[PDB]
Design a protein around this ligand. Structure first.
Ligand SMILES: CCS(=O)(=O)Nc1ccc(Oc2ccccc2)c(-c2[nH]c(C)c3c(=O)[nH]ncc23)c1
Length: 107
């Protein structure tokens, strides 16, 4: 679909240098072992990150833009669920979500 090409463009924007200061904690799966977040899998049933989303899009795992969008929002929701609301990573997720929501609304 044309909307799946729009999804590739959303990912290029989210990975761009302009947003790297707040997007970088979302680039790859949360490394629970390196970060000592041994309670993460008890709270987060479905972990999600930008590289996994990119691989799924490349592998045609999304039928349309809504399925793609649901994984991007799952990534943010995981961050909002796991961390206290005042956490630095939550502010970063909000900034990255602003980039996504603005671009997603254009299609
Ligand atoms: C590329 C993924 S990484 O795992 O390789 N690098 C990495 C490194 C540090 C990190 O922590 C922070 C904490 C404060 C500010 C910035 C990042 C995180 C991280 N990322 C998410 C989504 C987190 C979360 O929700 N809670 N705590 C930590 C989370 C991921």
């Amino acid at each position: 679909m044309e909307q799946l090409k729009c999804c590739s463009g959303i990912l290029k924007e989210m990975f761009a240098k302009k947003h790297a200061a707040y997007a970088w904690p979302f680039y790859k799966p949360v490394d629970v072992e390196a970060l000592g977040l041994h309670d993460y899998c008890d709270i987060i049933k479905h972990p999600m990150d930008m590289s996994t989303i990119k691989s799924k899009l490349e592998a045609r795992e999304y039928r349309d833009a809504q399925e793609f969008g649901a994984d991007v929002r799952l990534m943010f929701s995981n961050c909002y669920k796991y961390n206290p609301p005042d956490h630095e990573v939550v502010a970063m997720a909000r900034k990255l979500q602003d980039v996504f929501e603005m671009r997603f609304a254009k299609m």
